[PDB]
């Protein structure tokens, strides 16, 4: 009920802070556009634990592969600060002595146009 459940993810894996709800979700977004749509059709979560002590984070058939590496610059307490009480009622939980090291990736594309043009014009007469 309390354990290491903090999960950093990169920009391209930004999961919604709230459950999926049909009343909260809208169509705004569209190789170029391929990376665009992925932001909300994927990104509720199930961090699967494995016999080697690795973890895999799943938001589909696509996989983020994860290790519970230690942390020393970020020694905070994690807490559910909901606006209710005096000025955000932070409920106590786990301390940030570790955070995920993990792999989530992208790609590029190719192009081609033309070099120079014709020349050697001549006026009448």
């Amino acid at each position: 009920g309390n354990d290491l459940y903090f999960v950093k993810l990169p920009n391209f894996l930004s999961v919604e802070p709230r459950p999926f709800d049909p009343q909260y979700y809208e169509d705004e977004f569209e190789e170029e556009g391929r990376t665009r749509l992925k932001l909300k059709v994927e990104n509720n979560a199930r961090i699967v634990k494995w016999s080697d002590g690795s973890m895999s984070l799943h938001l589909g058939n696509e996989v983020f592969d994860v290790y519970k590496a230690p942390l020393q610059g970020d020694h905070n307490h994690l807490f559910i600060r909901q606006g209710t009480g005096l000025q955000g009622q932070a409920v106590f939980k786990t301390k940030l002595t570790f955070r995920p090291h993990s792999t989530d990736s992208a790609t590029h594309r190719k192009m081609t146009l033309s070099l120079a043009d014709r020349c050697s014009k001549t006026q009448k007469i």
């Binding site: 569209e30 190789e31 170029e32 556009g33 391929r34 594309r109 190719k110 192009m111 081609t112």
Partner: protein
């Protein structure tokens, strides 16, 4: 005409055609062309990878197995 009908990928031409397919996908601002390209690309990839594993099915396959277990 002569580029149209005969089976295109084997042996080397599939690599340049795969690149060309990628370029066709990337040059399109239209999502339909992109997705059609993506589909096409995946299919040719699969076909090609099958063909590669098929050729390597024998006597290449055998050496692959010893190298993975030796390291």
């Amino acid at each position: 005409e002569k580029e149209r009908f005969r089976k295109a990928p084997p042996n080397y031409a599939m690599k340049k055609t795969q690149l060309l397919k990628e370029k066709a996908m990337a040059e399109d601002l239209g999502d339909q062309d992109k997705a059609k390209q993506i589909q096409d690309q995946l299919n040719e990839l699969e076909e090609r990878a099958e063909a590669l594993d098929r050729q390597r099915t024998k006597n290449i396959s055998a050496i692959s197995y010893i190298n993975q277990r030796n390291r």
